[PDB]
């Protein structure tokens, strides 16, 4: 299913996307697909969708999203930076 980084071990109950967002906030850096899949032991399709879904939950997560060159490998990928998360 998925693994929970030691960074955020103490949030076992929260839904995956909250868990990911919180972890992201703790990196303070632009996070891509591969960064997430790595750290949560999920596959890449799943990692992409998580980013997509997070970006649609603006009442919960405050973030920015750019689409940027990497590599390259002359392509762009979606990266996300998560300011903070509301759990109330």
């Amino acid at each position: 299913d998925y693994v929970i980084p030691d960074s955020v071990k103490n949030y076992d109950g929260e839904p995956l996307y909250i868990l990911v967002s919180l972890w992201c906030k703790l990196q303070e850096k632009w996070i891509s697909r591969n960064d997430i899949a790595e750290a949560f032991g999920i596959n890449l399709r799943r990692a992409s969708f998580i980013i997509t879904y997070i970006s649609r939950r603006k009442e919960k997560i405050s973030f920015r999203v750019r689409y940027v060159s990497y590599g390259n490998l002359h392509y762009k990928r979606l990266e996300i930076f998560i300011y903070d998360v509301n759990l109330e």
Binding site: S55, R56, K58, Y67, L78
Partner: protein, 115 residues
């Protein structure tokens, strides 16, 4: 500097809304017709061949919010001119009847049509 009728075929698209919500989809152009979809919505339009393209957007997956957070069917306006590039397109598409609401679409050509 070229009109919106350019190559028939299949495109991948990436889009980002004015509030930085995003999505991934595919899009197919076939004559005067535009069809495509993603994980939560589908879209269609006719190339009126003289005007702006009206693209109709319908949500089929209610577990996931619209990228513009609209809770019914809406329409996007796609500009007549598109400007072109080498297998890459960047488009500004606003919601019909409200210009402050929009998506930036990054489209990449994959393949011609088999017929």
């Amino acid at each position: 500097a070229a009109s919106m009728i350019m190559k028939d075929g299949i495109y991948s698209i990436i889009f980002i809304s004015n509030e930085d919500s995003c999505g991934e989809g595919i899009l197919i152009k076939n004559g005067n017709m535009i069809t495509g979809g993603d994980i939560a919505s589908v879209y269609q339009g006719v190339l009126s061949e003289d005007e702006d393209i009206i693209l109709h957007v319908h949500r089929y997956n209610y577990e996931i919010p619209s990228v513009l957070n609209i809770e019914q069917d809406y329409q996007l306006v796609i500009p007549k001119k598109v400007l072109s590039n080498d297998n890459n397109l960047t488009l500004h598409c606003h919601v019909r009847g409200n210009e402050k609401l929009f998506v930036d679409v990054y489209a990449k050509f994959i393949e011609p049509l088999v017929i």
